[PDB]
Design an enzyme around this catalytic site. Structure first.
Site, short mmCIF file in Angstrom:
data_model
loop_
_atom_site.label_atom_id
_atom_site.label_comp_id
_atom_site.label_asym_id
_atom_site.label_seq_id
_atom_site.Cartn_x
_atom_site.Cartn_y
_atom_site.Cartn_z
CG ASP B 58 9.10 -44.88 45.57
OD1 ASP B 58 9.40 -45.27 46.71
OD2 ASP B 58 9.50 -43.79 45.10
CB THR B 91 8.13 -43.19 50.59
OG1 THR B 91 9.10 -42.23 50.17
CG2 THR B 91 6.76 -42.60 50.40
CB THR B 92 7.05 -48.21 52.06
OG1 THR B 92 7.15 -47.97 50.65
CG2 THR B 92 5.95 -49.22 52.32
CG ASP B 389 14.00 -43.40 45.91
OD1 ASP B 389 13.45 -42.28 45.78
OD2 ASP B 389 13.42 -44.38 46.43
N1 LIG Z 1 19.43 -56.88 52.08
C1 LIG Z 1 18.57 -56.45 53.02
N2 LIG Z 1 18.27 -57.21 54.09
C2 LIG Z 1 17.41 -56.79 55.04
N3 LIG Z 1 16.78 -55.61 55.01
C3 LIG Z 1 16.99 -54.74 54.00
C4 LIG Z 1 17.91 -55.12 52.92
N4 LIG Z 1 17.93 -54.10 52.05
C5 LIG Z 1 17.09 -53.15 52.53
N5 LIG Z 1 16.53 -53.53 53.69
C6 LIG Z 1 15.57 -52.75 54.49
O1 LIG Z 1 14.47 -52.37 53.66
C7 LIG Z 1 14.11 -51.01 53.88
C8 LIG Z 1 13.95 -50.32 52.54
O2 LIG Z 1 12.68 -50.67 51.99
P1 LIG Z 1 12.07 -49.74 50.83
O3 LIG Z 1 11.39 -50.61 49.81
O4 LIG Z 1 13.13 -48.75 50.44
O5 LIG Z 1 10.96 -48.97 51.69
P2 LIG Z 1 11.14 -47.40 52.00
O6 LIG Z 1 11.08 -46.76 50.65
O7 LIG Z 1 9.98 -47.07 52.91
O8 LIG Z 1 12.48 -47.32 52.68
C9 LIG Z 1 15.23 -50.37 54.69
O9 LIG Z 1 14.69 -49.87 55.92
C10 LIG Z 1 16.22 -51.47 54.99
O10 LIG Z 1 16.44 -51.54 56.40
MG LIG Z 2 14.38 -47.18 49.97
#
Ligand SMILES: Nc1ncnc2c1ncn2[C@@H]1O[C@H](COP(=O)(O)OP(=O)(O)O)[C@@H](O)[C@H]1O
Ligand SMILES: [Mg+2]
Ligand SMILES: Nc1ncnc2c1ncn2[C@@H]1O[C@H](COP(=O)(O)OP(=O)(O)O)[C@@H](O)[C@H]1O
Ligand SMILES: Nc1ncnc2c1ncn2[C@@H]1O[C@H](COP(=O)(O)OP(=O)(O)O)[C@@H](O)[C@H]1O
Ligand SMILES: [Mg+2]
Ligand SMILES: [Mg+2]
Lengths: 533, 526, 159, 527
Positions: B58, B91-92, B389
């Site tokens: 995270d 957050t990322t 989350d």
């Molecule tokens: N199966 C998937 N295929 C493509 N993109 C995805 C998928 N699942 C999630 N994402 C993308 O990944 C991002 C989530 O990454 P995450 O590790 O939660 O970072 P953050 O916490 O900053 O959102 C979302 O913006 C989403 O668009």
């Molecule tokens: Mg997320």
């Protein structure tokens, strides 16, 4: 190419001060060597010819003695294996009271021969199995080696003869006199009821006149004085109070509230009259000796002096219960006069002076009671402490005799017979355990060898003579100390006997310690850090 | 000897060097957590200064454990915390976006463009981003539980709990739904206070569940109390059930003989009176935030009442919410309303080597306890973070039912729309506008990079695809590195999360662009 | 079994959630006269705790983290750290007195713990040192959004 | 160097393959240390603490805790093993070995350029298949005395020496069967474990009652009571100060004496109530009266009780209230407001044993004690600690066997069968996760390998013999530690807890998957 890095894995993750010993040659042999060192440093104090050792602890206190348990206690042993063997020795001392040096010597010899067996090719498991089998065989054989029995514990002469051998190793020069003293003290205790209490034998050490002037007193002696002026009572009627010899007070808060002049002028007079009435009520019950566990008030002391009451102040409550037991009184919680059943009776209570010490003596003319005191004289504190240790050994031997009356010959006769029988048994059994059984049998030779070495003669000739005699058929033959050449004599005729129960427990504990040390294969020592205690 | 204007330890620097340092620090912060985005992200191990271990992927959990000296990095960490607290997700993404916009702003600062022009362009682009996001959103029927579960799944596909997705989604949805409250015309969810997550190491993760009530780590005060009651009536208290001193100094003055005994008897009688006041309501369970005296225990037990003492205030509030009770301070004011009826079972069972009190059959409860049972403490902490989350995402969707395509599709669509808008400004600030518009492509780029596929080819294909008419939902498959429409893959994000991410990133860029001087060393002067 | 201190685990769990913004770090004193003019300065009614250490000696980082947690939980106290060599301690101090807890109150010492490894351990937790300090009564007795504090003209009405 | 070191110069970072290398090296080191613990033929380790305390142990958890390691991955493995011991009470060494071998097998493929994600996918598929196989291979049997004896031996033989293992097996099984209630969860708090230090290790046994570590505090108390009425109370029989700062005010010595006499009326009244109850229940010298109090008794009340032939104990353990109520059958009292003979327990023999400076009280010959005690006797402190740990492990094993309706064959048979099933199922799994499935099977095969190695045989030949026998016959065959030939573990009686195996699979797979995905170990909380 100028440094050997630490091996990856556990070697790197180990803490900075930690030590890791693993394998046979790095752990087992080191433990065996340490145990052998401990056995060597204690060996020379074995038997009547054993030599005292001046041991100074970390508090600069000086101990001179040949008691193995005390020597091990006063040594700062740091090796864990030697610590384990010392724990075994202390357990033997706690369970029986004599045989600690035997335990240590036997464990050392067993571990030495175990190292030899491991070097010739035997495994740890096979050595342990052979040692256990041989220990079971020795425990089975031991009852058959019993020579005679106590058959009487109320006789002074019989008890003295039985206890001579136990306190012959310590204080070899003069053991008959100490044996007689301890026999008298023990026979005074140990009533018709079979239970005997070691704690009932008290020892008082008074300096000045040599140990040959020691005496046994049927009663108690306290190194104190009398609060009052009365110092001698011939028909004492002791009343024991667990409360201070003073008017009792409240427990939340005592505040005297005065509102008139008459109360102010009468308060002290009333308190004095009440104290006088209480003391007179105590005295009117025929009491003439009062023992208190607390402080003595000025008014109470004055009124006790007025009525001719002997006051003794015993601070320690253990002494209070001991006095209640020996006189036959009950520690009252209040200052009420004692009822007829709670009055303690002693034949004579007086203030005496032995050497330069003021003592109060509770003396019974009858040759009985519940607590008996041995007044130890001497010319040195260390000598008196050593005599006290010998007295403790004799009392523990008497207690063991009360528990079990069977006796086995001393002077290494029992050890030699056990070695011979176990060696004979080891021939019959096939397999790889025969080597371990034979080594267990040979480990019994360390006792007669130690006795011969301390006596100043050749150990090998003594051992060969003992084997020849035992092969002939005389199983009660040990070495003769009073000889300038290796010689043997009958232990049963000479009366050199030691308790069967003590030997049994010593053998069991030594074997358990040896096998427990052998079972250890890895050592992970934490950083010593601090922790003085 | 020396005379100075400012203090000796006061160090000051200014100019292009300060801007370069700020932007480099922001880029470094972004690079720290760059690889922790997407369904194919890899976890990180954090060593606490206290000796603990944090193993997570995270953004906020990683960033809050880093101590930095450059104040720009401190600002970025505060941004991460703000994003985590406001919405709970993205957050990322916000950190990565802020780093990218600061890089593309440094590009212009190298030339002779004033930072204020770049800031104005950034604000205009932020307004247009908000407009485009609101335009390309779709509504969500909150009644449909399947759609909500799908949204939560898309939220938690990128975390370590994704292997148990149905269970986690159901747990989060049930907790959020049953913690929902509406009193006095005011609607609240309150995930922070209620819906407590209790983790017990051991067992299997599939055994985890959300309880229809509250579980606390307490045991009955006396062995003869009943450890299993079918339909208990529960009374909650604040004040102790023991005799205690008053506030004023109240020393007594005993002169008669019997006054001490009378005082002791009055103390016992006061305890008995308190217990009788409790008993008069005929309850079955008594819970106290403070101690309960042994005599009080005896008097309660004579009426066959189970008593638990020394419970935390938060736990007592949660129990009151779950079982429909009301905490009462003075027992003499207990009413029938205050007694909590609605709990359908109370049980004190043993888990491992410790006792736990369960009230887990409440009818219509407004509070819950999530029972996490996993391999160890760190695994359970990560699972708790992922559940938090998921619950935050569920609450955000429930508050605002707008939905936005995920996997970089929304960002590419917004970038294309902003580029088309910039095709008509014909000014001097158009270049920073278009640059910060195209800076949104960093998250599709890092998604492709984490997937391991070719960045350039996939990005070019996606950019070409978004130039068509109806292609706002075309994104990148995070685990296969292929261009897939997101009305088929089903990855969608709440509109609130995207809005917060864009606003926070652009405002962080503005804040760090408005600075060209750093002075340090002065004492707090307090 | 009251010696097990079941409340210690829950206290540690509550301490793990101490603060949101940051963990914060223990102030490092860089000079002797700085030490003098920070012990003499500040209100005398507050307790100031000084940490004595040298780099490399074991038994230090655990109590650094403990003081970090204490400063996080306790805003009143003024936990601070300073190198042993910077002050200029003697050889005996540098050889057997590295763990030193210097406590200031009223401008004078009220707690002077040194050689605390035996009474604390080597990898002790925050609760252990907190209880050790509480053994002598050394510890004096909501969460805002971010901040609230914003002449003396307050308000009036019509008059 | 890296980003973090740029931001925090005094930071330690391991990145990409460095993190994998560090974690796998730590796991391999822990596995190398704990290899010799597995099996009854394993070596005994001696641990010396900083203060010099000596401890002999064979447990994985005990060895891990007193092993001077300051590693992060070792900390994670220690936490996993701690949870395993907390819930199931067994399988710590197997846990560590399986984690280490899973990481090693995964590295065997990762070093060839393969991504850890595929390995994790294969691991989870193999875990699901192994769980299905474990469900389909468990032996659902009635938990009679013989099966519990078999399980207890299987644990204690691995923990202690053979004869001590048999003695502890008998004691543990008897205690569990004594406290167990039909269709009711077993409360292990009802088995008090007491340590004595005067006899040999084989002298430990089971008392169908309770043993207390404190005795009577009055010298006139009766040292042995044959027929005993047990009064379990939680009432302070000593003097108690008023809560509201009373204080005494008098004007003469007589008034002071009256106040002193009258300040004990409360405690004297309570003692009089106790004495009246004792006189009511027993009007003769045949039946004795025993009072066990959780709170202290002052000397005045002690003397008053002793004058009536009542033996009284004070400062008893809090759990002893429940233990005595369940064993003697009485009712614990927090006040003597209304006490009747129906609140009194019964004990067929109460006597005191004195050992050194410690006094012990024994309560035997109860009717149907639902709470019994285990007396640990040994010549050494380390012996007592080792026997206590072994007893804990055996009690947990028997409780787990009772709880689950089934039991799983041990001696590595179930792991070999799981590996065979996983190899058979590998073609079903699509993609490159077949490598992960193979790694999982090879990691599961660690248990028979380590057992054979500890027994003194060779890993490869013994393992191929076991596998060939299992494939040819289909029987659940494991390693025979005396001969090396395969044996049917079910027939011999080598039983493993099904819950222990399931927890092992779940926890090991989860922790291995989480560790393999870590790509950066970081420490930047300073400066
Ligand atoms: N199966 C998937 N295929 C493509 N993109 C995805 C998928 N699942 C999630 N994402 C993308 O990944 C991002 C989530 O990454 P995450 O590790 O939660 O970072 P953050 O916490 O900053 O959102 C979302 O913006 C989403 O668009
Ligand atoms: Mg997320
Ligand atoms: N007069 C004697 N002649 C020969 N051997 C003796 C004599 N007295 C005692 N012994 C031997 O000395 C041994 C006692 O040794 P001792 O120093 O008491 O060791 P421990 O104190 O450990 O028992 C006994 O085994 C006994 O056989
Ligand atoms: N007598 C025996 N013969 C063959 N195998 C055994 C025997 N006793 C135990 N085992 C096997 O050896 C293993 C012992 O593991 P153990 O040392 O208890 O590890 P842990 O302490 O982690 O549970 C068990 O899995 C069991 O199957
Ligand atoms: Mg002797
Ligand atoms: Mg086991």
């Amino acid at each position: 190419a100028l440094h050997v890095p630490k091996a990856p894995g556990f070697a790197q993750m180990l803490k900075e001060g930690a030590k890791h010993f693993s394998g046979l040659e790095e752990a087992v042999y080191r433990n065996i060597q340490a145990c052998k060192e401990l056995a060597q440093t204690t060996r020379t104090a074995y038997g009547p010819n054993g030599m005292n050792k001046m041991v100074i602890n970390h508090l600069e206190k000086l101990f001179v003695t040949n008691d193995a348990a005390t020597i091990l206690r006063e040594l700062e042993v740091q090796h864990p294996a030697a610590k384990m063997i010392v724990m075994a020795s202390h357990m033997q001392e706690q369970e029986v009271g004599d045989g600690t040096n035997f335990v240590l010597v036997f464990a050392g010899a067993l571990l030495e021969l175990a190292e030899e067996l491991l070097r010739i090719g035997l495994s740890v498991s096979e050595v342990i199995e052979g040692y256990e089998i041989a220990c079971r065989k020795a425990h089975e054989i031991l009852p058959n080696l019993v020579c005679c029995s106590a058959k009487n514990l109320r006789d002074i002469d019989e008890v003295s003869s039985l206890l001579r051998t136990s306190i012959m190793s310590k204080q070899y020069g003069n053991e008959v006199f100490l044996a007689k003293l301890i026999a008298q003290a023990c026979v005074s205790i140990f009533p018709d009821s079979g239970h005997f209490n070691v704690d009932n034998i008290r020892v008082c050490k008074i300096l000045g006149s040599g140990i040959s002037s020691s005496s046994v007193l049927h009663g108690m002696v306290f190194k104190k004085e009398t609060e009052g002026d009365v110092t001698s009572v011939k028909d004492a009627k002791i009343a024991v109070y667990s409360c201070p010899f003073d008017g009792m007070i409240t427990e939340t808060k005592g505040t005297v509230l005065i509102k008139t002049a008459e109360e102010l002028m009468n308060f002290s007079k009333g308190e004095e009259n009440l104290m006088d009435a209480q003391v007179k009520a105590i005295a009117d019950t025929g009491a003439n000796v009062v023992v208190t566990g607390g402080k003595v008030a000025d008014m109470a002391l004055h009124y006790a002096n007025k009525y001719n009451i002997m006051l003794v102040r015993l601070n320690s409550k253990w002494d209070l219960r001991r006095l209640c037991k020996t006189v036959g009184a009950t520690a009252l919680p209040r200052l009420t006069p004692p009822v007829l059943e709670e009055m303690g009776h002693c034949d004579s209570v007086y203030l005496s002076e032995v050497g330069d010490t003021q003592v109060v003596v509770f003396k019974h003319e009858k040759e009985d009671g519940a607590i008996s005191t041995i007044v130890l004289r001497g010319s040195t504190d260390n000598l008196m402490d050593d005599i006290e240790r010998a007295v403790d050994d004799g009392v523990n031997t008497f207690k063991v005799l009360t528990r079990d009356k069977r006796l086995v010959p001393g002077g290494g006769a029992t050890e030699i017979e056990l070695a011979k029988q176990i060696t004979s048994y080891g021939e019959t059994c096939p397999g790889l355990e025969q080597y371990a059984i034979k080594k267990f049998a040979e480990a019994f030779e360390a006792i007669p060898r130690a006795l011969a070495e301390n006596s100043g003669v050749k150990a090998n000739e003594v051992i060969s003579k003992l084997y020849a005699v035992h092969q002939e058929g005389n199983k009660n033959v040990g070495l003769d100390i009073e000889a300038e050449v290796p010689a043997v004599k009958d232990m049963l005729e000479a009366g050199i006997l030691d308790t069967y129960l003590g030997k049994y427990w010593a053998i069991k504990l030594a074997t358990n310690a040896a096998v427990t040390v052998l079972r250890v294969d890895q050592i992970i020592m934490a950083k010593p850090a601090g922790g003085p205690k | 000897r020396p005379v100075l204007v400012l203090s000796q330890n006061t160090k000051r620097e200014s100019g292009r060097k300060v801007q370069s340092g700020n932007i480099n620090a922001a880029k470094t912060i972004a690079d720290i957590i760059r690889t922790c985005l997407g369904p194919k992200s890899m976890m990180k191990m954090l060593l606490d200064p206290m000796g603990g271990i944090v193993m997570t992927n995270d953004g906020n959990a990683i960033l809050r454990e880093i101590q930095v000296q450059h104040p720009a990095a401190k600002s970025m960490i505060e941004i991460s915390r703000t994003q985590d607290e406001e919405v709970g997700d993205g957050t990322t993404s916000v950190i990565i976006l802020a780093g990218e916009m600061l890089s593309v702003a440094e590009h212009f600062l190298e030339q002779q463009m004033h930072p204020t022009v770049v800031i104005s362009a950034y604000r205009k682009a932020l307004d247009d981003m908000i407009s485009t996001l609101k335009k390309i959103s779709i509504p969500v029927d909150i009644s449909d539980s399947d759609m909500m579960l799908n949204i939560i799944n898309s939220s938690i596909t990128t975390k370590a709990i994704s292997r148990w997705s149905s269970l986690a989604c159901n747990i989060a949805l049930d907790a959020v739904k049953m913690v929902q409250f509406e009193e006095n015309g005011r609607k609240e969810i309150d995930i922070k206070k209620y819906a407590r997550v209790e983790k017990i190491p051991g067992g299997i993760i599939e055994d985890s569940c959300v309880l229809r009530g509250v579980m606390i780590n307490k045991d009955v005060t006396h062995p003869r109390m009943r450890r299993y009651i079918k339909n208990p009536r529960i009374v909650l208290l604040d004040s102790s059930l023991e005799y205690k001193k008053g506030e004023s100094q109240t020393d007594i003055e005993i002169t008669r003989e019997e006054d001490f005994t009378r005082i002791l008897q009055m103390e016992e009688e006061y305890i008995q009176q308190l217990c009788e006041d409790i008993i008069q309501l005929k309850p079955d369970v008594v819970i106290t935030e403070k101690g309960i005296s042994d005599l009080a225990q005896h008097y309660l037990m004579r009426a066959n009442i189970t008593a638990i003492r020394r419970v935390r205030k938060t736990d007592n509030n949660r129990i009151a919410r779950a079982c429909g009770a009301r905490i009462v301070s003075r027992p003499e004011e207990l009413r029938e309303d205050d007694v909590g009826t609605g709990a359908g079972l109370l049980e004190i069972k043993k888990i491992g080597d410790e006792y736990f009190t369960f009230i887990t059959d409440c009818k219509d409860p407004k509070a819950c306890t999530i029972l996490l049972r996993g391999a160890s403490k760190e695994i359970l902490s990560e699972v708790e973070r992922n559940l938090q989350d998921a619950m935050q995402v569920c609450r955000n969707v429930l508050l605002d039912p707008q939905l936005v395509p995920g996997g970089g599709a929304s960002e590419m669509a917004v970038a294309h729309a902003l580029t088309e808008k910039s095709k008509a400004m014909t000014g001097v600030e158009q270049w920073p506008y278009r640059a910060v518009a195209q800076a949104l492509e960093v998250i599709p780029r890092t998604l492709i990079q984490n997937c391991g596929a070719s960045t350039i080819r996939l990005l070019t294909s996606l950019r070409a695809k978004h130039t068509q008419e109806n292609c706002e939902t075309w994104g990148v498959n995070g685990e296969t590195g292929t261009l897939v429409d997101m009305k088929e893959l089903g990855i969608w994000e709440p509109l609130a999360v995207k809005l917060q991410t864009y606003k926070t990133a652009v405002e962080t860029a503005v804040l760090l662009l408005r600075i060209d001087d750093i002075v340090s060393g002065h004492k707090k002067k307090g | 079994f009251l010696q097990q201190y079941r409340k210690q685990r829950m206290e540690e769990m509550r301490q793990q959630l101490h603060k949101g913004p940051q963990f914060k770090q223990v102030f490092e004193i860089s000079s002797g006269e700085g030490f003098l003019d920070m012990i003499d300065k500040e209100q005398k009614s507050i307790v100031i705790m000084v940490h004595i250490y040298e780099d490399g000696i074991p038994g230090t980082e655990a109590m650094n983290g403990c003081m970090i947690c204490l400063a996080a939980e306790y805003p009143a106290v003024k936990f601070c750290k300073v190198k042993s060599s910077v002050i200029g301690a003697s050889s005996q101090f540098t050889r057997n007195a590295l763990p030193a807890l210097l406590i200031y109150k009223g401008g004078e010492l009220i707690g002077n713990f040194v050689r605390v490894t035996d009474q604390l351990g080597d990898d002790f937790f925050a609760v252990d040192l907190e209880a050790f300090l509480q053994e002598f009564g050394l510890l004096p007795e909501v969460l805002t959004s971010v901040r609230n504090s914003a002449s003396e003209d307050s308000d009036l009405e019509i008059d | 160097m890296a980003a973090v070191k740029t931001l925090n110069p005094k930071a330690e970072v391991a990145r990409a393959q460095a993190a994998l290398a560090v974690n796998i090296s730590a796991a391999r080191g822990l596995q190398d240390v704990l290899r010799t613990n597995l099996g009854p033929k394993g070596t005994m380790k001696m641990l010396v603490s900083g203060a010099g305390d000596i401890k002999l142990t064979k447990d994985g958890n005990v060895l891990l805790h007193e092993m001077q390691i300051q590693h992060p991955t070792a900390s994670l493995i220690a936490k996993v093993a701690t949870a395993q011991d907390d819930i199931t009470g067994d399988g710590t060494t197997s846990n560590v070995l399986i984690i280490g071998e899973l990481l090693k097998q995964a590295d065997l493929y990762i070093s060839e350029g393969l991504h850890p994600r595929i390995i994790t996918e294969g691991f989870e598929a193999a875990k699901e298949k192994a769980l299905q196989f474990l469900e389909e291979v468990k032996v659902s049997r009635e938990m009679d005395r013989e099966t519990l004896i078999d399980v207890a031996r299987t644990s204690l033989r691995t923990k202690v020496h053979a004869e001590l293992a048999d003695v502890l097996t008998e004691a543990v099984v008897d205690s569990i069967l004594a406290i167990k209630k039909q269709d009711e969860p077993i409360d292990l708090f009802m088995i008090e474990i007491m340590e004595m230090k005067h006899k040999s290790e084989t002298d430990t046994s089971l008392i169908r009652g309770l043993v207390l570590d404190h005795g009577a505090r009055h010298p006139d108390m009766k040292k042995r009571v044959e027929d005993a009425y047990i009064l379990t109370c939680n009432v302070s029989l000593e003097y108690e100060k008023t809560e509201v700062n009373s204080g005494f005010f008098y004007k003469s010595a007589e008034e002071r004496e009256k106040l002193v006499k009258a300040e004990r009326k409360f405690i004297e009244d309570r003692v009089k109530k106790i004495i009246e109850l004792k006189r009511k229940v027993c009007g003769d010298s045949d039946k004795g009266f025993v009072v066990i109090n959780q709170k202290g008794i002052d000397p005045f009340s002690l003397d008053a009780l002793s004058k009536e032939g009542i033996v009284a104990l004070r400062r008893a353990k809090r759990r002893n209230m429940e233990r005595l109520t369940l064993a003697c059958g009485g009712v614990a009292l927090n006040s003597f407001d209304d006490l009747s003979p129906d609140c009194l327990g019964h004990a067929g023999l109460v006597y005191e044993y004195t050992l050194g400076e410690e006094k012990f009280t024994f309560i035997e010959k109860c009717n149907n004690p639902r709470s019994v005690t285990l007396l640990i006797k040994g010549p050494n402190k380390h012996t007592l600690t080792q026997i206590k740990d072994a007893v804990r492990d055996g009690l947990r094993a028997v409780k787990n066997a009772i709880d689950d309706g089934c039991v799983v064959p041990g001696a590595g048979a179930v792991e070999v069968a799981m590996a065979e099933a996983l190899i058979k199922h590998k073609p079903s799994v699509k993609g490159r996760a077949q490598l992960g499935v193979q790694a999982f099977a090879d990691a599961l095969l660690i248990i028979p390998k380590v057992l054979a190695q500890n027994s003194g045989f060779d890993l490869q030949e013994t393992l191929v013999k076991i596998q060939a026998e299992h494939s040819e016959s289909g029987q659940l065959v494991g390693v025979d530690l005396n001969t090396g030939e395969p044996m049917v573990a079910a027939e011999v009686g080598v039983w493993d807890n099904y819950c222990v195996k399931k927890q092992l699979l779940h926890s090991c797979t989860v922790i291995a998957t989480n560790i393999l995905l870590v790509d950066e170990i970081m420490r930047a909380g300073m400066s």
